[PDB]
Amino acid sequence: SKGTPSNGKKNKRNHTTCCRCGSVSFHKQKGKCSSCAYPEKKMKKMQNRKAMLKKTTGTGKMRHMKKERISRRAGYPGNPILKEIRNKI
Amino acid sequence: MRHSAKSWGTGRAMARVPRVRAGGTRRAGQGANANFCRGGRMFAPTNVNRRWNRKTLLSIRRYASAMAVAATSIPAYVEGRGHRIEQIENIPLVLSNKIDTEKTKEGIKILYNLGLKEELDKVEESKNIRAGKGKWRNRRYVLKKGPLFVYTSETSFTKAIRNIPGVDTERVENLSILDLAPGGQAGRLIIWMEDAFEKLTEIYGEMNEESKFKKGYTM
């Protein structure tokens, strides 16, 4: 029967951890990730605005982008040992 | 309106309000979007398209300001607002030009000589913290209204008197009804400058004539 007794046979596992996004959604037989479309070059279309804002720029650390803004503020000064190269250029 | 919600329909022994689709949390099966629901949407949400300002005819604005100015020289009205004028010799007050004052120290001595001491004291003693939620929204302290000084020509006296509590300043040419009738009751006490007092004849004209300064207006 289709209820409790059929639950006993459910011991196989079709999805594993995706290497691009972490989300335990890589379908091994299809060769595709259901969250991010790996191995396609572009990321997947997200279903709605609510769901996509959960993965935008600024939801993580933004390491490089923050440093760039501080350097731009300072006038891109560079390493002080090498000022002469900068000044010539 | 954020959540994914749907009605369960009849046959489940429950009211047919929309409910939240979820699992693993106590939030499953709770009642979603309606105005009678916790965390739902308000009835007729407030909206930016409301009409904030109001029109008034220019002819009424001109007439109201004229009869507000008039009331500043009837003792019954001035006393009625709550300005105290027991010690003042006569109304209206007109200060001369050739006031060479630059310091607040000497400025107060002048105002005391015109009899204003009791009025000024009445303002200083008044400061209190407002009752209600307004004290959280940048409206913390309340003070009583005092004298308004009206000038027309630029003078040092303006920056000598301004730090004294309850003193207020405006030019005659752009004198406003909010300053002339606070709270919608008329008869504010006014210190005129000699130049400003003479200018009232150009501004409002003469009875059954037309003002040159206010085109299309007659008294």
Binding site: - | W136, N138, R140
Partner: protein, 131 residues
């Protein structure tokens, strides 16, 4: 009246600026007045209280007392003064902290960099006073 529009007059903003202060701005919170004599001995009118300096308590329970500053709590803005304490049920004694502004300085601790700190402030005045 304030005529500069870059400075805030919001109650919410002024309060956050107080409690979340750090660095030099935190040091400004620990300032106290000098006595009349010291204001002739030195140019300064007020300084940040440090251990070892001598203070008169001018407000509160311990009014009129005099003593040496033992400790400076920067996180919970309080100073501990020698001989200002309460006794528990146990008989054990706990120093009670006083807010900086309720103190007045009577003698300065001149250990370490204090003499240079004072010099730096006096010069900063004269630089603009004489102009």
């Amino acid at each position: 009246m304030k005529f500069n529009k870059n400075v805030t007059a919001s109650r919410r903003k002024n309060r956050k600026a107080h409690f979340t202060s750090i660095g030099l701005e935190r040091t400004k919170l620990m300032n106290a007045p000098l006595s009349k004599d010291l204001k002739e001995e030195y140019g300064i009118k007020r300084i940040a209280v440090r251990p070892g300096d001598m203070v008169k308590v001018v407000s509160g329970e311990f009014k009129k007392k005099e003593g040496v500053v033992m400790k400076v709590n920067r996180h919970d803005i309080k100073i501990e003064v020698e001989g200002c304490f309460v006794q528990k049920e146990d008989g054990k004694k706990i120093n009670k902290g006083i807010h900086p502004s309720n103190l007045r300085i009577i003698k300065l601790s001149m250990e370490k960099d204090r003499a240079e700190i004072i010099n730096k402030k006096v010069e900063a005045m004269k630089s603009e006073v004489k102009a």
